[PDB]
Amino acid sequence: FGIDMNTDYTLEEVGKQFDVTRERIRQIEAKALRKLRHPSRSEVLRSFLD
Amino acid sequence: GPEEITADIPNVGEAALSKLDESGIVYIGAEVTGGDILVGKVTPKGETQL
Amino acid sequence: FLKPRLVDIEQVSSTHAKVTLEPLERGFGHTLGNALRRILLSSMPGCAVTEVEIDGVLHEYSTKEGVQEDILEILLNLKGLAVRVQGKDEVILTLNKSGIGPVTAADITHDGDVEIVKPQHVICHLTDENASISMRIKVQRGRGYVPASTRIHSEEDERPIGRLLVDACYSPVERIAYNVEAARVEQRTDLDKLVIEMETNGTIDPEEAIRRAATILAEQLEAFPEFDPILLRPVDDLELTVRSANCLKAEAIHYIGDLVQRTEVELLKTPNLGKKSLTEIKDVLASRGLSLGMRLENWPPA
Amino acid sequence: TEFLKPRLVDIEQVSSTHAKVTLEPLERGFGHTLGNALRRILLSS
Amino acid sequence: GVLKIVKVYLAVKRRIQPGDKMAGRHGNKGVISKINPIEDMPYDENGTPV
């Protein structure tokens, strides 16, 4: 995403910047969001949705 | 685009949609207080630019 | 240090009576009397009608065809209906009548604890040969004045819009007056009497009221954060289909926290849950960042 | 139709022979009847 | 520009509360200050409050 940064970067671009590219990165995000999905992490963000 | 009186309202619970008929208009004889939706109205605004 | 007591209770009417107290020391008739007047007027059990569902009426602001009374007038008339119950704190009665003529308070169906003090009391009139009115009159018991406006906070699906809430008039007492006259008992220097002349609707006995009054009066002398909030929401907040909700409730799943603990396997083993219902549940849970087989470990705290 | 008893007291007394006692919860109109009846009794008898 | 209009008619019932203005026909105005219990009301020898 563009969080605290200029614009945002394509998964391939993020791959170039991480030296480990493609599908790999797409997985991390999926497991990242997952970790943010379950409560005690997500309850602070949950109230933001009305 | 044209505005709609439809009962389909973005971001509302069933408690909110309860007082409205299928068309989106509050029932006759239904007692209401501040904040209750009398007539559901929705207007097009595309590409929210987040 | 002579303590008072009661004497002849004179009932002059179904409406009102004069209760009297003999053994009163110097100046105590006033101290006891006014204090008694206060509690008498203020705090007393009452049975005043609360909820009323009428025939074809959505709101109290309409007029029903066949009755010259406006619906609001009929509610206001009902509020002035005096009834007394025994074993029930809240009873619901049923009123039915038709043809040309006045509908009185004796036209209701008589229940076990129902006692109508004014059978002649007019609820509403009937102007046409064939015109009929049925209504459920929900009568509950309480203390003090509870207006219809403050009655809605709790809410909790008063959805039967045909049900019009009315202001609570709970109190037997209308007028209370106390006069102290010097009361000469056979031998004693000087003592006073207490003549409390009260006014009621007939739904409370004088001895009873006068008793509870001083009962309360003396009764006052007795001293003289982790985890998701969403987990404790009822399943109805998930807004599932009636079938799924009833099935879950039948499986002892009343809250979201109970549901997120269950797995697909376990849920499919239930007698009433098919693949469609499970699809729906997974969909609505995923739509709010939840799922099945969620562990929260510590169910429940308090 | 249960009733209300007080639940918060705090006798704040000045010196010894003087005292100011207070009670928070109390049903409407009970404060006057209690205060007055106790005052009448306290003074006259 | 207006496709359709929905007019809902509310019936609100208010009784009386402090801040309301009351007056006789003699040019004597006033505002209800506090709503006093029947208990505290000045009463005659008959026992009828005011």
- List strands edge to edge, sheet with C163-165: C90-98, C132-140, C49-53, C163-165
> In CATH, what number is assigned to the domain containing residue C186?
3.30.1360.10
CB–CB of C8/C1 below 8 Å? Answer: no
Q: Look at residues C136, C153, C170 and tell me which one is the last residue of a structural domain.
A: C170
DSSP-assigned beta bridge partners for residue C176? C198
Q: Do the chains contact at E45 and C179, CB–CB below 8 Å?
A: yes
Report angle CA C192, C193, C197 to the nearest 5 degrees. 150
**Chain B, nearest residue to E4 by Cα:** B5
Distance set, CA C221 to CA C73, C215, C217, C218, C274 (Å): 44, 10, 7, 5, 63
Side-chain half-sphere of E22: how many Cα atoms within 13 Å?
Answer: 9
Do C222 and C250 lie in one domain? The reply is no
CA atoms of E20 and E30, how far apart (whole Å):
8
Both C147 and C190 in one domain: the answer is no
Q: Would you put residue C42 in left (φ > 0), alpha (ψ -120 to 50) or beta?
A: alpha
Residue D44 in tokens: 């006259």
Distance separating alpha carbons of residues E4 and B5, to the nearest angstrom: 8
Are residue C235 and residue C222 in the same domain, yes or no?
Answer: no
Chains E and C touch (3+ CB pairs under 8 A): yes
Q: Give the pair of three-digit tokens for residue A33.
A: 């969001």
Q: Which of C44, C76, C176, C197 to mutate to test the interface with E (most CBs of E within 10 A)?
A: C176
Which tokens is C34 given?
A: 């006014």
* Closest Cα in chain C to E36: C42
| CB atoms inside a 10 Å sphere around CB C9 | 14
Give the method used: X-ray
User: Under an 8 A CB cutoff, do D29 and C35 touch?
Assistant: no
- Looking at the structure, do residues C218 and C240 belong to the same domain, yes or no? no
Give the mutation candidate from C54, C150, C239 for the B interface (greatest B CB count, under 10 A): C239
Q: C66 and C54, same structural domain?
A: yes
Question: Which range marks the domain in which residue C282 is found?
Answer: 231-301
Q: Which own/partner contact pairs does C114-122 have at CB distance under 8 Å and 24+ positions apart?
A: C114/C83, C114/C85, C115/C83, C115/C84, C115/C85, C115/C203, C116/C82, C116/C83, C117/C14, C117/C82, C117/C83, C117/C84, C117/C201, C117/C202, C117/C203, C118/C81, C118/C82, C118/C201, C118/C202, C121/C77, C121/C80, C121/C81, C121/C82, C122/C77
Contact between E49 and C173 (Cβ < 8 Å): no
Q: State the CATH number of the domain containing residue C99.
A: 2.170.120.12
Residue B26 bridge partners (DSSP): B20
Q: Which residues contact C140 (CB under 8 A, 6 or more apart)?
A: C47, C50, C51, C89, C90, C91
Q: Are residues C8 and C103 both part of a single domain?
A: no
Same domain for C46 and C113 = yes
Q: Is B13–C239 a contact, with Cβ atoms under 8 angstroms apart?
A: yes
Measured between beta carbons, the chain C residues lying within 8 angstroms of D29 are 38, 42
Q: How far apart are CA C9 and CA B39, in angstroms?
A: 62
**The two three-digit tokens of residue D16, written as one number:** 């010894």
C121 in the same domain as C218: no
Which one-letter amino acid corresponds to residue C9? I
CA distance C151 to C166: 9
Count of domains for chain C: 3
What does the DSSP 8-state code read for residue C80?
T
Any idea what the CATH number is for the domain that residue C241 is in? 1.10.150.20
C28-42 and C206-220 are packed helices; what angle lies between their axes, rounded to 10 degrees?
100
Choose one of C195, C214, C230: the last residue of a domain.
Answer: C230
Distance separating alpha carbons of residues C276 and A6, to the nearest angstrom: 45
**What's the gap in Å between the CA of B47 and the closest CA on chain C?**
22
Q: How distant is the Cα of D9 from the closest Cα of chain E, in angstroms?
A: 25
Same domain, C17 and C163: no
Interface contacts (C, D; CB < 8 Å): 52
- Please tell me whether residues C60 and C46 are part of one structural domain: yes
Distance between CA atoms of C292 and E8, rounded to whole angstroms? 43
What DSSP assignment string belongs to A5-25?
Answer: SSS---HHHHHHHHSS-THHH
Q: Of the candidates C203, C230, C257, which is a domain's last residue?
A: C230
CA distance A37 to C237: 20
Whether the CA torsion C262, C263, C265, C268 is positive or negative: it is positive
Out of D23, D29, D41, name the one closest to residue C42 (CB): D29
The backbone torsions φ and ψ at residue C138, rounded to the nearest 5 degrees and listed phi first, read: -95, 110
Do C88 and C236 fall into the same domain?
no
Please state the φ and ψ torsions of residue C264, each to the nearest 5 degrees. Answer: -60, -40
Alpha carbon distance C48, C56 (integer Å): 24
Q: Are C47 and C140 contained in the same domain?
A: yes
- Across the interface, of C42, C59, C179, the residue whose CB is closest to E37 is C42
